[PDB]
Amino acid sequence: PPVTHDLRVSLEEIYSGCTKKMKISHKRLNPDGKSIRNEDKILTIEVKKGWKEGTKITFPKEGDQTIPADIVFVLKDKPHNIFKRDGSDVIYPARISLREALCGCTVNVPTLDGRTIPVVFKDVIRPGMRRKVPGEGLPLPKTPEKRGDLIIEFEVIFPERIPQTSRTVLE
Amino acid sequence: PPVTHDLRVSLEEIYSGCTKKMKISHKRLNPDGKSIRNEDKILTIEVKKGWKEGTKITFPKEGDQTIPADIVFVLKDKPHNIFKRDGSDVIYPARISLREALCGCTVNVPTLDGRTIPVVFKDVIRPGMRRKVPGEGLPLPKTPEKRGDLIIEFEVIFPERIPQTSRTVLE
């Protein structure tokens, strides 16, 4: 009769990999065969770079005291407030103005390392369009050596309203 | 040991409901206990208005000849070249130009009955935006009386390129 527990991991944590120690509380029958203990246990866990979230981590019979469940942790992606994980890829929503989308603009794409990258656009940018940024993603598990890509996904914000005059011009 | 068979139904067929007769071919042991027949069978099927596709239809032991499988048909939505079914709702993608999206336009929404409906738009239309059209959808099974809605989903087609001059103006 195992037990499941979610393991929250920041996107940067998955980028470089991290040590996460979890505090649990189980039961121990103690020198009686009647009384039960409270005692806890700090289970340490190594999260290897870019682990497809969802990967399971088991701790043998860490459960209670009659046989004790196998306490398992399921890796889960903490929603990040800048990127959307997509496997080894990390999507980056670019909120651009209609003017920018038409007359060209520059996008300072932020990196996991914590740096920025300038990417220029001359041609008309279509809503939905996306520019891939090679290797700016997450390291691939099988080959932590190489990393996935960063994907720019543009959102064109339109103006709220258009003056009676602007209409004329817009032809 | 049953047998499954997909049942292709046009969206209009699901709108009004239809009779669909399927031609199958089974086996019959014949007066021997050795020889086997070829003989077919035209299984008629009543498709009630707006049936959530996927609904199963069984034909008792229509299978072979030793016990014969139960030939079952799974309702499937024929992809329609104008609408996208969404339950009792039918989505309608409106390919509009950026000019139209900004200066207002008129959308002649086509109906399942085979008629058109004019819907006006004054305010700036945003890419992704959608206008619901009450009761223009598919009849609800539980209540064939009332129908679902027709949903307009706009797609703003941007111009391919913008002349060196247009840029200036666009401010």
Residue numbers in the entry:
A (entry chain A), B (entry chain A): 162 to 227, 231 to 335
Paper quotes:
The crystal structure of the Hdj1 putative peptide-binding fragment was determined to 2.7Å resolution by the molecular replacement method using the Sis1 structure as the search model. The Hdj1 monomer structure contains domain I, II and the C-terminal dimerization motif. The two Hdj1 monomers are associated into a homo-dimer through the C-terminal dimerization motif. The Hdj1 homo-dimer forms a U-shaped architecture and a large cleft is formed between the two elongated monomers. When the domain II of Hdj11 is superimposed with that of the Sis1 structure, we found that the domain I of Hdj1 in the complex structure was kinked about 7.1° away from that in Sis1 structure. The domain re-arrangements within Hdj1 were achieved by the rotation of the linker region between domain I and domain II (residues 242 to 249). When we examined the peptide-binding site on the domain I of Hdj1 structure, several hydrophobic residues were identified to participate in forming the peptide-binding site. These residues include L168, M183, I185 and F237. In the Hdj1 structure, K181, K184 and K242 are well-positioned to interact with the EEVD motif from Hsp70. The peptide-binding site in the Hdj1 structure is not occupied by any amino acid residue, so the Hdj1 structure may represent the free Hsp40 state.
Members of the Hsp70 and Hsp40 (DnaJ-like) families function in specific pairs that form transient complexes with non-native regions of polypeptides to promote the folding, assembly and transport of proteins within the cell. All types of Hsp40 proteins contain a J-domain that can stimulate the ATPase activities of Hsp70. The human type II Hsp40 Hdj1 has been shown to function as a molecular chaperone to promote efficient protein folding. Hdj1 can bind to the non-native polypeptide and suppress the protein aggregation.
